[PDB]
Write a structure and sequence with these properties.
Subunit structure: Homodimer.
Subcellular location: Secreted
Enzyme class: transferase
Largest sheet: 8 strands, mixed
Helix content: 25-40%
Bound molecules: ~{N}-(4-aminophenyl)-2-selanyl-benzamide
EC number: 2.3.1.122, 2.3.1.20
Number of domains: 1
Distance between the termini: 31 Å
Number of helices: 11
Family: Belongs to the mycobacterial A85 antigen family.
Order of helices and strands: EEEHHEHEHEHHHHEHEHH
CATH topology: Rossmann fold
C-alpha cells in the first residue's frame, strides 16, 4: 500500500469545463511523456486505486516518464456519457473522454510541461477497455495502451447486462445513461473488439493481461462464478485471436497460469511493461 515517503508526488486540481468541476489528479513529474494510470470500477474520490494498492509512483520514479493518476469517476468507464446517471441522482454528466483527451492534457502541457502526444494509457478492470479505446481514437496521444483484466467486448452478448449490473453495484450507476440501450451505436463505438481494426491501422502498441479466477469486480449475486469465468476466458481468447486475424502484429499478451484479477498481479504487469514503455515513448 502506497509508495515510500518523500517522492515528488503532487495533488493537482485540474479544471474540467465539461463536467463543471475540478478533477483531482495525482501527478509525479519525470519527463515530457507520461503514463496515464486509470483506475478500476470502484474508483474513489480520495486517491487513485493504483496509489492505494501499489507502489506505482515509487516503481516509476526516475523512469524518465511522468506518472498521471486521475482521481474519481466511479463506474465512469472514462467515457463521455449521454447524460447523468438516472439511478443515483448524479448532478452532472460524466465527460471523462473529453477530460482525458482535451482538458487534462491541455492543462498539464501549460502547467507542468507534459507533452499532449506520445503517452501511454494503462487501465485495469473497467478502464482496461478504456485504455484501448483511447488509443484507438487518439493514436497521437496514446501510441501505447495496456488493458489489465479489461472488458474487451462490452457490446456483445451478455456483456452489456453484466456491465450494467456491475455499474449498479458500484455506486448505483446506470449503464443506459452512459451509452444508451445495448442497441445504441455507442456500445460498439467503445468496444475494443469491434475497434481492433483501428488498433491495427494505427499500429498501437498494446499490452493485454488476462487473469484467472472469478472476476471479483462483479458478477452480481445471482450469477454463478463458473459462468462468469467461462465467459471471460472465451471473450479474451476471442480478442487475442481476432487481433491476430485482423493483421495485428504489435500486441503483447500475458496469461500467466497463476495470475488473478487482483492488484498484486496488475502491479506485476505495470512493472513488467516499464522498459517496454520507456522504449516506445522515449526511444
Ligand atoms: Se491473454 C489470453 C487469453 C486467453 C487465451 C490465451 C491468452 C494468451 O495470451 N496466450 C499466450 C500464448 C503465448 C504467448 N507467448 C503469450 C500469450
Amino acid at each position: 500500500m502506497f509508495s515510500r515517503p518523500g517522492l515528488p508526488v503532487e495533488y493537482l486540481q485540474v479544471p474540467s469545463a465539461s463536467m463543471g468541476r475540478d478533477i483531482k489528479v495525482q501527478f509525479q513529474g519525470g519527463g515530457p511523456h507520461a503514463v496515464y494510470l486509470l483506475d478500476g470500477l470502484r474508483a474513489q474520490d480520495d486517491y487513485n486505486g493504483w496509489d492505494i494498492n501499489t507502489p506505482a509512483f515509487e516503481e516509476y520514479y526516475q523512469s524518465g516518464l511522468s506518472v498521471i493518476m486521475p482521481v474519481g469517476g466511479q463506474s465512469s468507464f472514462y467515457t463521455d456519457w449521454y447524460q447523468p446517471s438516472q439511478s443515483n441522482g448524479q448532478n452532472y454528466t460524466y465527460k471523462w473522454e473529453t477530460f482525458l483527451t482535451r482538458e487534462m492534457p491541455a492543462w498539464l502541457q501549460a502547467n507542468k510541461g507534459v507533452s499532449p502526444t506520445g503517452n501511454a494509457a494503462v487501465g485495469l478492470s473497467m478502464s482496461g477497455g478504456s485504455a484501448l479505446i483511447l488509443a484507438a481514437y487518439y493514436p497521437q496521444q496514446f501510441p501505447y495502451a495496456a488493458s489489465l483484466s479489461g472488458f474487451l467486448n462490452p457490446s456483445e452478448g451478455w456483456w452489456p447486462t453484466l456491465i450494467g449490473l456491475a455499474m449498479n453495484d458500484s455506486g448505483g450507476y446506470n449503464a443506459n445513461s452512459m451509452w444508451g440501450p445495448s442497441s445504441d451505436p455507442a456500445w460498439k463505438r467503445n468496444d475494443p473488439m469491434v475497434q481492433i481494426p483501428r488498433l491495427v491501422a494505427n499500429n498501437t502498441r498494446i499490452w493485454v493481461y488476462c487473469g484467472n479466477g472469478t472476476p471479483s469486480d462483479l458478477g452480481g449475486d445471482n450469477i454463478p462464478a463458473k459462468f462468469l469465468e467461462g465467459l471471460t476466458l472465451r471473450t479474451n481468447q476471442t480478442f487475442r485471436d481476432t487481433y491476430a486475424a485482423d493483421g495485428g502484429r504489435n500486441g503483447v499478451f500475458n496469461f500467466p497460469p497463476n495470475g488473478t484479477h487482483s492488484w498484486p498481479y496488475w502491479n506485476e504487469q505495470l512493472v513488467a511493461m516499464k522498459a517496454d514503455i520507456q522504449h516506445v515513448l522515449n526511444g
